[PDB]
Design a binder for this molecule. Structure first.
Ligand code: HEM
Length: 153
């Protein structure tokens, strides 16, 4: 479990992300798509996007970036009492979108990279450590719901 002081480092940087949810959402999905191109194939919406310039230009992509970061934000603010927010998410991503747990690892890495670019001063080593622990807790709880449904994978 994260300590109270670790949750404080997580939500202090998240308050800064909320100053520009759209810009953050974009950078993160673009990082994910460039780093792990197999993740782009899961999106019938975005599959057509070939270059980083096209990705940057897409309004629909920025719109989905907002959706993802808003959902994640609602989860983080529950500080690990996140069961009501997490279970709908795991159910759609396992059974409808078919998203392997490993891709949730990949997007965690993207989030940490972008938080590091945008917020050096608020995202030093202990904030980075806390953020990693928080995203691990997210994955761990999703994984458990996947296993239940027969998707552990
Ligand atoms: C921080 C992690 C993530 C969060 C908070 C998240 C959140 C969401 C939300 C809230 C929706 C709309 C409601 C729903 O269908 O559940 C959605 C849709 C979806 N997500 Fe995620 N997601 C995450 C990770 C991923 C990853 C890693 C992939 C792809 C590798 C993925 C693929 C999709 C797809 C394909 C859809 C449907 C998109 C469409 O409208 O066509 N998600 N996600």
């Amino acid at each position: 479990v994260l300590s109270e002081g670790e949750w404080q480092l997580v939500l202090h940087v998240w308050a800064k992300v909320e100053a520009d949810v759209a810009g953050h959402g974009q950078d993160i999905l673009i990082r994910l798509f460039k780093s792990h191109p197999e993740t782009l194939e899961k999106f019938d919406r975005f599959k057509h996007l070939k270059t980083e310039a096209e990705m940057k230009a897409s309004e629909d992509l920025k719109k989905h970036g907002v959706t993802v970061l808003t959902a994640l934000g609602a989860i983080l603010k529950k500080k690990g009492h996140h069961e009501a927010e997490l279970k709908p998410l795991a159910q759609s991503h396992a059974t409808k979108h078919k998203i392997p747990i490993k891709y949730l690892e990949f997007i965690s890495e993207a989030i940490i990279h972008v938080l590091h670019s945008r917020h050096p001063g608020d995202f030093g080593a202990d904030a980075q450590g806390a953020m990693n622990k928080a995203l691990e807790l997210f994955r761990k709880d999703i994984a458990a719901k996947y296993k239940e449904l027969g998707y552990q994978g």
